[PDB]
Design an enzyme around this catalytic site. Structure first.
Site, PDB file in Angstrom:
ATOM      1  N   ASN A 117      11.388   8.093   3.195  1.00 56.97           N
ATOM      2  CA  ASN A 117      10.280   8.923   3.659  1.00 56.97           C
ATOM      3  C   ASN A 117      10.763  10.125   4.459  1.00 56.97           C
ATOM      4  OD1 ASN A 117       8.067   7.806   2.488  1.00 56.97           O
ATOM      5  ND2 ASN A 117       7.371   6.679   4.296  1.00 56.97           N
ATOM      6  N   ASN A 159       3.978  11.993  -1.645  1.00 55.49           N
ATOM      7  CA  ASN A 159       3.462  11.374  -2.853  1.00 55.49           C
ATOM      8  C   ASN A 159       3.444  12.358  -4.018  1.00 55.49           C
ATOM      9  OD1 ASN A 159       3.148   9.072  -1.331  1.00 55.49           O
ATOM     10  ND2 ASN A 159       0.947   9.357  -0.990  1.00 55.49           N
ATOM     11  N   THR A 199       9.927   3.613  11.947  1.00 55.63           N
ATOM     12  CA  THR A 199       8.500   3.306  12.146  1.00 55.63           C
ATOM     13  C   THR A 199       8.189   1.811  12.239  1.00 55.63           C
ATOM     14  OG1 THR A 199       7.968   3.416   9.764  1.00 55.63           O
ATOM     15  CG2 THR A 199       7.807   5.438  11.030  1.00 55.63           C
ATOM     16  N   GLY A 247       6.007  -5.925   4.764  1.00 56.14           N
ATOM     17  CA  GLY A 247       5.806  -7.332   4.479  1.00 56.14           C
ATOM     18  C   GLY A 247       5.518  -7.680   3.035  1.00 56.14           C
ATOM     19  N   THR A 248       4.378  -7.223   2.509  1.00 57.40           N
ATOM     20  CA  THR A 248       4.000  -7.614   1.154  1.00 57.40           C
ATOM     21  C   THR A 248       4.762  -6.826   0.098  1.00 57.40           C
ATOM     22  OG1 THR A 248       2.158  -7.783  -0.410  1.00 57.40           O
ATOM     23  CG2 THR A 248       2.017  -6.062   1.270  1.00 57.40           C
ATOM     24  N   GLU A 252      18.584   4.746 -21.865  1.00 57.13           N
ATOM     25  CA  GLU A 252      19.899   5.357 -21.701  1.00 57.13           C
ATOM     26  C   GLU A 252      20.284   5.493 -20.231  1.00 57.13           C
ATOM     27  OE1 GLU A 252      17.711   6.646 -23.899  1.00 57.13           O
ATOM     28  OE2 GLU A 252      18.770   6.018 -25.708  1.00 57.13           O
ATOM     29  N   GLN A 274       0.814  -1.213   0.000  1.00 58.98           N
ATOM     30  CA  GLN A 274       0.000   0.000   0.000  1.00 58.98           C
ATOM     31  C   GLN A 274       0.848   1.263   0.000  1.00 58.98           C
ATOM     32  OE1 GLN A 274       1.380  -0.660   2.744  1.00 58.98           O
ATOM     33  NE2 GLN A 274       0.727   0.492   4.541  1.00 58.98           N
ATOM     34  N   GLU A 327      -3.667  -6.964   1.040  1.00 60.38           N
ATOM     35  CA  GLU A 327      -4.857  -6.629   1.801  1.00 60.38           C
ATOM     36  C   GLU A 327      -5.731  -5.660   1.011  1.00 60.38           C
ATOM     37  OE1 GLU A 327      -1.807  -5.535   2.880  1.00 60.38           O
ATOM     38  OE2 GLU A 327      -1.928  -3.445   3.536  1.00 60.38           O
TER      39      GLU A 327
HETATM   40  N1  LIG Z   1       6.764   6.727   0.066  1.00 58.59           N
HETATM   41  C1  LIG Z   1       5.854   6.271   0.923  1.00 58.59           C
HETATM   42  N2  LIG Z   1       6.199   5.310   1.853  1.00 58.59           N
HETATM   43  C2  LIG Z   1       5.279   4.840   2.730  1.00 58.59           C
HETATM   44  C3  LIG Z   1       3.984   5.321   2.695  1.00 58.59           C
HETATM   45  N3  LIG Z   1       3.288   4.690   3.663  1.00 58.59           N
HETATM   46  C4  LIG Z   1       4.106   3.826   4.305  1.00 58.59           C
HETATM   47  N4  LIG Z   1       5.344   3.908   3.736  1.00 58.59           N
HETATM   48  C5  LIG Z   1       6.541   3.144   4.125  1.00 58.59           C
HETATM   49  O1  LIG Z   1       6.299   1.752   4.154  1.00 58.59           O
HETATM   50  C6  LIG Z   1       7.054   1.176   5.197  1.00 58.59           C
HETATM   51  C7  LIG Z   1       6.484  -0.159   5.662  1.00 58.59           C
HETATM   52  O2  LIG Z   1       5.687  -0.769   4.666  1.00 58.59           O
HETATM   53  P1  LIG Z   1       4.106  -0.503   4.712  1.00 58.59           P
HETATM   54  O3  LIG Z   1       3.726   0.560   3.713  1.00 58.59           O
HETATM   55  O4  LIG Z   1       3.775  -0.083   6.115  1.00 58.59           O
HETATM   56  O5  LIG Z   1       3.299  -1.853   4.382  1.00 58.59           O
HETATM   57  P2  LIG Z   1       3.723  -2.986   3.328  1.00 58.59           P
HETATM   58  O6  LIG Z   1       5.094  -2.773   2.745  1.00 58.59           O
HETATM   59  O7  LIG Z   1       2.701  -3.051   2.224  1.00 58.59           O
HETATM   60  O8  LIG Z   1       3.662  -4.318   4.216  1.00 58.59           O
HETATM   61  P3  LIG Z   1       2.379  -4.641   5.126  1.00 58.59           P
HETATM   62  O9  LIG Z   1       2.385  -3.823   6.406  1.00 58.59           O
HETATM   63  O10 LIG Z   1       2.418  -6.095   5.509  1.00 58.59           O
HETATM   64  O11 LIG Z   1       1.139  -4.343   4.322  1.00 58.59           O
HETATM   65  C8  LIG Z   1       7.035   2.224   6.293  1.00 58.59           C
HETATM   66  O12 LIG Z   1       8.218   2.179   7.052  1.00 58.59           O
HETATM   67  C9  LIG Z   1       6.963   3.528   5.533  1.00 58.59           C
HETATM   68  O13 LIG Z   1       8.239   4.122   5.507  1.00 58.59           O
HETATM   69  C10 LIG Z   1       3.632   6.288   1.764  1.00 58.59           C
HETATM   70  O14 LIG Z   1       2.484   6.720   1.727  1.00 58.59           O
HETATM   71  N5  LIG Z   1       4.571   6.763   0.877  1.00 58.59           N
HETATM   72 MG   LIG Z   2       4.895  -9.864   1.958  1.00 57.97          MG
END
Ligand SMILES: Nc1nc2c(ncn2[C@@H]2O[C@H](COP(=O)(O)OP(=O)(O)OP(=O)(O)O)[C@@H](O)[C@H]2O)c(=O)[nH]1
Ligand SMILES: [Mg+2]
Ligand SMILES: Nc1nc2c(ncn2[C@@H]2O[C@H](COP(=O)(O)OP(=O)(O)OP(=O)(O)O)[C@@H](O)[C@H]2O)c(=O)[nH]1
Ligand SMILES: Nc1nc2c(ncn2[C@@H]2O[C@H](COP(=O)(O)OP(=O)(O)O)[C@@H](O)[C@H]2O)c(=O)[nH]1
Ligand SMILES: [Mg+2]
Lengths: 428, 63, 426, 201, 428
Positions: free
Chosen positions: E197, E219, E170, E135-136, E245, E11, E62
């Protein structure tokens, strides 16, 4: 090509520059929003639809001054990134702006000076406005000039600094901020102009004859001095001078770099009718001891070099007669080794007037920046007050807890006493 | 008596509160305006007078 | 921005702080229910210095009220501007300090420590950077002197690089309520010299007497008694929230006043204090204020500076007024009061143009001054100690809660060593 | 449609525009309904704008300006903490310029007429009186709500009281000013007001 | 013809994706429905009556954001099964997203990847966006790069991943998630671009200077950056440097493709009026050692290569002078075997700013996608966080219960240590 920046550090720097940038904005036809409804290059920068950004920094540790120009009518003429604030006042302490938290201000102030300097075809000015006795005027004023000395090597450092008065000081640690600032102002700045407050309240007493001037009427006079000093960079004139040769015109010696300021004619609009201000009489009205702005008598001080800046419809031949009758006049002391000590520049435009100010419109004006030995007597009285502060070590251990070592008062003393002795051997 | 109490020797209020910087360093063409309603504004003579030279002084720049 | 943290300590401190929060609130133009009214940038742009937001636009002061008896705090909810404070900011004592320094500092005040730190740290660290503190307390009773000096003994070593201003209400030579006078006065002051940044001395006995000639009214209540204090309470910190031509803050005010770390006791006074008959008949100007604040008879402290000598003076003028009329008019008072000022400091004064006038008045001044004239007031407290300590009188109540005859004798020794520099700086 | 679909301005929008488009239908390859660029409005009628001394100002004054709605209530203490700050920002734009640049229109959340006047006399910029139904239909357009009483149409409130928002020619918002929003920059977000991209043209 | 395929995993990658496709649709003149009232062909297909669908895939295990997009504004710009979502969140578990729950939509994701790739020949590359620290985003991203390297081995793989920062990360198990995806993007990803981030937090608080913006503003800045990358694909200009390139010139080794990103000038609303958009100063601010998006200080690292994508009415001469003065500054250095390491791809189209967003309409812009040996410090602190956590079996049983064997934990650690020795050895 013509380009001079300004660095206003301290509440005196912001307040004087408040008058400076309102005088400069009315002279180039610039509204307070910045856009005109090629001489603006030397103080401003073109951007967008003719909207002009001044090449300037407004620096101050404390709020309630720098936000006052962030909330007045000149908010949107200044770039909001040279407007610099902290939270803590330097608190009339030299070591607060030099040995504790002011690093967060100077580390980004050098960034803003670098950004301003990467806008320039050629640099020729470093006009620094400050108070000597203020905490951030001496504290950060010392730290900014040592940083700019090692950053930018062999350029001209201008400095219009407010020396404390012989009589009033409005503080008890004015000697403690003056000897410390001077100990590092000898080796850092190149041109130091002495300004002093009730030289100029007394100026507004007997000349402008208004019953209540204030600090803001002080700054309007000082802005008129700076405007005539650098008018040669703006407009064409009969004999164009340059700020980068004031450096080679005035100072004889590397450690002798303190000069004076005086402005004339200064007559309000009521008495500007009985007499027609001629060139030969504005020179005498500027050379008189009661018109200079540091209340040091040039009767007991030997003149060394002298520079006159002219602004208006003035021909050079009655200038030549005016400087001749000054040279043959005996009440102005000239010293025996230097027969040629005058540099006169002539500019075409008449001096500008703030709309409805205490100053009256005039067709001609003279500004005088003069080196003389009389600075040794201003400095010898502040010299005497420093020992009488240091007699039983008053107000010293809060400096020690601030970060200075107990004992650097001694070499700041010996630098000031070396300043006392060397004008004496020059004058012989 | 007052409208503000014991410390108030007379009545001014916060409506009369500005600063010197705000009241005086206001826009300049505005500052031309309210002052316009309240009062805004060897000797060498002209070539007519026969003092010093007057023959060839009249010819290149008459006055 | 710059945050000041206010504490009400003791019955006198609670009542004198209530009037100050009334005079600051209407100076900023604020209805006592919290809503701002008055329509000015210049009284609202700096409101976070004393106040805090409440996510409704409501402003709550940064003041905690602390007292060991519930009596006089119930009076300040009952009185005007009682809804202005935060309810959590009050901390309660259900016993009542019975005029004893011992239960103020050691025994009964110990169980209120864990609650008073949790409310003063909560208010402090919520802002980005604290500037100083400002407490109001009296040395007369127990819950003001002992329970108040316990605050200074703890807030300094946890916030070391900050300052505070303590406005201490000092007892009387002539009149005497709170019959155990010298024990509470001495036990607070030896802590107060070591560990407090400055002390403003406020004297009830003298401030009846300003209220008897220059304000000359026959029936002085505690209301206008505190209202005369709250003028100089407000004027000493006016430039923290207001702009000016030549500024001043508390940290600057300490740097250029205190020369040596063991003298920080300051006179205080407010000018003008014009009589009711004389209200319309003063075309008020700078010359007549300067003689009013360099007037011994108009000092809030019960010390005559004719006997003493001003080590350093200070004046925070307020309003639309000329700046050299500050300057060479004080050079006139040095040249005429040559023997009233110390000869090894030239230009002994502050000038500070707080550009905002007081509430309703066109122009005023607030005088604070380090004076050696306080040595006579400090030695009569010393002989008041010794007269009642040779007879061991009123000691059994103190010793029963963990006092010592030893700890009383460094209280007098620090008292004598406090007076000692004053007569040899003359 | 802009910025909100369901609003009393925008149901009058569609009712006005394709009505005159169906006037053009039997008058004559017209397409029904018109595109959102083709819809045009008048935001304020002739008898809406009142200045300080209660005289009418037409729509023609607003040309070449940056006009912003000011959704406010007198008794709200957050409006009390904002009102001097926006007074300062008005006089800095107006006096610092040959032609005065921004313009603020008032709509109110007050209780009655008497409370409206006490908040009106402190304000030099133009205003809309409470008895005009133009105020209430503007509440539901820009979604400014004190406490949720009137039924919202599947929306969540964008602002809180008070809120200033700059607009365009056809009821759209140009850019948001977050004094109480997802950014909640109170008393500082007035500096975010631009005047090069939002001109009431 | 000429098109690219964008992938979003997790996400975080979705919240990047709805931002980039927010900006892509507005600059091409098309709407959330898909209609415009042939430069758009690289991002949008043509379907009959002018309706456009993006060439993207949305992947998230999810539904918490995928069906929320399906209820949001952009319902019908996207294809229905373009947005692929399972039921169960992988929940910070690389093993869960690699073995058990990932494979149920791996076969679904390759089916949509095949169907969009075979639509038109002349595909250039894959632009994948994911979260390494989750994770994902880490686990399902590893399988997609594993199964795309075996089908489309030749085609480009440009990655843009949200690597953590040393201060704020985080999470508590992200040392395991990041170094377990380290094994995936060395031998599969062609060129990897490190984003962060909290570095974009640093940019938006001092340069565009909002005190509290959030994920939705990072974003926008990512959307601006990827727009300036892909600009040379979409629109004509002076020089055309497209995504085939970008790897020819920035990466000199098969194992060295970890490299940073920078954007200048990120201008607030108030800053656009005064600050003139000189090409000299936008390149200086792009090269500013704290203006990039990684928390990656380059003052103690060397520069391998650099590409500068200018976007607007940009002349190449002051570009050539801008890259002249960046070599003459002693502050930064390049690596000793590469004296020339700059690219200047210019596009005539000005940047497309969002009204009501946070940036302003800038006439010119520059995007700096640079390779440096400064990857060593951002990976060695990462190595140290793994060392203190792996030593006591923390959060290890979660992965071994999901199918992943203990021992792949170890070999990913010396895989990162081998890359650390690669960056150390190459900077000699
Ligand atoms: N660039 C950017 N990074 C984000 C954003 N939201 C979360 N992250 C980063 O994503 C990292 C962890 O992954 P998540 O986005 O929380 O979730 P995931 O990678 O899909 O894994 P799950 O929690 O299992 O769904 C966090 O440490 C954030 O730094 C966002 O809106 N923009
Ligand atoms: Mg995963
Ligand atoms: N000529 C002139 N002098 C000024 C002005 N403002 C302050 N000064 C002088 O500066 C001295 C004190 O320094 P300030 O400028 O007031 O304060 P500061 O520079 O901010 O340093 P701090 O004391 O730490 O606040 C006073 O003695 C004044 O004489 C001014 O506007 N014009
Ligand atoms: N200025 C002022 N002084 C007071 C007030 N009430 C009591 N005092 C003085 O304080 C002394 C009593 O100390 P107090 O603070 O009441 O004792 P505490 O309650 O134990 O702290 C008396 O001598 C009074 O002169 C008041 O409201 N204002
Ligand atoms: Mg200062």
């Amino acid at each position: 090509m013509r380009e001079v920046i300004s660095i206003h550090v301290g509440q005196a720097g912001i307040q004087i520059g408040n008058a400076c940038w309102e005088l400069f904005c009315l002279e180039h036809g610039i509204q307070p929003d910045g856009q005109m409804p090629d001489a603006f290059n030397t103080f401003f920068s073109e951007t967008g639809a003719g909207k002009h950004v001044p090449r300037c920094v407004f620096l101050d540790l404390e709020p309630t001054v720098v936000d006052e120009v962030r909330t007045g009518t000149y908010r949107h003429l200044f770039h909001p990134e040279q407007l610099i604030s902290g939270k803590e006042d330097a608190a009339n302490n030299f070591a607060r702006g030099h040995y504790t938290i002011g690093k967060e201000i100077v580390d980004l102030s050098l960034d803003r000076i670098r950004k301003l300097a990467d806008n320039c075809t050629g640099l020729q000015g470093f006009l620094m406005f400050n108070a000597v006795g203020g905490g951030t005027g001496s504290g950060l004023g010392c730290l900014l000039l040592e940083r700019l000395s090692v950053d930018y090597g062999k350029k001209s450092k201008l400095n219009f600094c407010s020396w404390p008065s012989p009589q009033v000081s409005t503080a008890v640690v004015e000697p403690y901020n003056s000897v410390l600032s001077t100990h590092s102002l000898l080796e850092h700045t190149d041109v130091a102009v002495m300004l002093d407050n009730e030289a100029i309240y007394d100026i507004c007493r007997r000349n402008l004859d208004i019953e209540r001037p204030t600090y803001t009427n002080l700054n309007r006079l000082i802005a008129q001095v700076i405007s005539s000093l650098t008018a040669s960079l703006r407009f064409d004139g009969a004999l164009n001078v340059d700020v980068t040769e004031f450096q080679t015109n005035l100072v004889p010696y590397p450690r002798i770099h303190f000069m004076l300021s005086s402005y004339a004619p200064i007559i309000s609009a009521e008495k500007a009718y009985h007499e027609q201000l001629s060139v030969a009489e504005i020179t005498n009205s500027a050379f008189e001891p009661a018109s200079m702005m540091a209340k040091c008598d040039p009767r007991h001080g030997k003149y060394m070099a002298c520079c006159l800046m002219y602004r208006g419809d003035v021909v050079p031949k009655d200038v030549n007669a005016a400087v001749a009758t000054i040279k043959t006049k005996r009440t102005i002391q000239f010293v025996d080794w230097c027969p040629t000590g005058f540099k006169c520049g002539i500019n075409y435009q008449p001096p500008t007037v703030v709309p409805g100010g205490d100053l009256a419109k005039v067709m001609r004006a003279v500004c005088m920046i003069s080196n003389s030995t009389a600075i040794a007597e201003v400095f010898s009285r502040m010299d005497h007050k420093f020992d009488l502060m240091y007699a039983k070590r008053a107000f010293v251990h809060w400096y020690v807890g601030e970060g200075m070592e107990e004992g650097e008062f001694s070499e700041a003393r010996e630098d000031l006493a070396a300043l006392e002795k060397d004008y004496e051997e020059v004058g012989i | 008596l007052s409208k503000y109490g014991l410390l108030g020797h007379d009545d001014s209020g916060a409506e009369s509160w500005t600063t010197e910087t705000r009241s005086e360093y206001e826009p300049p063409r505005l500052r031309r305006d309210q002052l316009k309603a309240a009062g805004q504004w060897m000797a060498i003579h002209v070539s007519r007078t026969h003092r010093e030279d007057y023959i060839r002084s009249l010819t290149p720049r008459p006055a | 921005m710059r945050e000041i943290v206010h504490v009400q300590g003791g019955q006198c401190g609670n009542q004198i702080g209530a009037k100050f929060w009334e005079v600051i609130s209407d100076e900023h133009g604020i209805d006592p229910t919290g809503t701002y009214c008055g329509d000015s940038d210049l009284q609202l742009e700096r409101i976070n210095v004393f106040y805090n937001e409440a996510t409704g636009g409501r402003f709550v002061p940064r003041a905690i009220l602390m007292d060991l008896e519930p009596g006089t705090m119930d009076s300040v909810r009952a009185g005007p501007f009682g809804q202005l404070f935060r309810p959590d900011n009050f901390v309660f004592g259900q016993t009542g300090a019975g005029n004893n320094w011992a239960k103020g500092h050691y025994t009964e005040g110990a169980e209120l420590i864990d609650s008073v730190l949790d409310v003063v740290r909560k208010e402090a660290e919520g802002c980005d950077c604290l500037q100083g503190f400002q407490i109001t307390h009296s040395l007369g009773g127990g819950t003001g002197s002992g329970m108040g000096t316990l605050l200074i003994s703890k807030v300094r070593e946890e916030y070391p690089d900050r300052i505070m201003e303590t406005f201490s209400v000092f007892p009387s030579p002539k009149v005497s309520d709170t019959v155990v006078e010298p024990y509470n006065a001495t036990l607070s002051v030896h802590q107060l010299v070591e560990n407090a940044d400055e002390v403003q001395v406020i004297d009830n006995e003298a401030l009846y007497d300003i209220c008897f000639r220059t304000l000359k009214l026959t029936t002085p209540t505690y209301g206008d008694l505190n209202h005369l204090v709250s003028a100089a309470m407000s004027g000493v910190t006016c430039c923290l929230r207001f702009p000016g031509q030549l500024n001043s803050d508390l940290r600057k005010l300490a740097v250029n006043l205190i020369p040596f770390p063991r003298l920080h006791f300051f006179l205080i006074g407010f000018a003008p204090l014009t009589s009711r008959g004389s209200q319309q008949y003063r075309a008020l100007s700078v010359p007549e204020l300067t003689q009013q604040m360099f007037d011994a008879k108009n000092m809030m402290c019960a010390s005559d500076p004719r006997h003493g000598r001003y080590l350093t003076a200070s004046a925070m003028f307020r309003g639309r007024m000329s700046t050299k009329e500050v300057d060479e008019q004080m050079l006139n008072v040095q040249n005429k009061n040559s023997s009233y000022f110390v000869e090894w400091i030239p230009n002994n004064m502050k000038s500070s143009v707080c550009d905002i006038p007081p509430k309703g008045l066109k122009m005023s001044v607030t005088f604070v001054g380090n004076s050696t004239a306080i040595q006579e007031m400090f030695k009569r407290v010393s002989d008041q100690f010794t007269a009642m300590f040779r007879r061991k009188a009123f000691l059994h109540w103190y010793t029963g809660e963990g006092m010592d005859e030893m700890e009383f004798t460094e209280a007098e020794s620090n008292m004598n060593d406090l007076v000692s520099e004053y007569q040899q700086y003359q | 449609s802009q910025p909100v679909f369901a609003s009393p301005l925008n149901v009058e929008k569609r009712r006005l525009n394709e009505e005159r488009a169906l006037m053009q239908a039997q008058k004559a390859n017209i397409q029904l309904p018109p595109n959102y660029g083709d819809m045009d409005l008048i935001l304020f009628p002739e008898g809406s704008l009142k200045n300080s001394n209660n005289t009418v100002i037409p729509q023609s004054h607003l040309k070449g300006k940056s006009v912003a709605l000011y959704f406010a209530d007198g008794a709200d203490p957050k409006c009390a903490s904002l009102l001097p700050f926006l007074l300062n920002y008005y006089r800095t734009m107006n006096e610092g310029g040959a032609n005065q640049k921004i313009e603020i229109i008032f709509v109110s959340l007050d209780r009655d007429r008497e409370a409206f006047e006490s908040h009106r006399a402190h304000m030099p910029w133009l205003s809309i009186d409470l008895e005009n139904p133009l105020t209430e239909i503007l509440k539901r357009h820009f979604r400014v709500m004190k406490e949720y009483e009137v039924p919202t149409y599947g929306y969540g409130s964008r602002t809180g009281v008070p809120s200033v928002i700059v607009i365009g020619s056809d009821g759209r918002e140009a850019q948001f000013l977050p004094i109480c929003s997802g950014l909640e920059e109170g008393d500082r977000a007035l500096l975010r007001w631009d005047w090069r991209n939002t001109k009431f043209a």
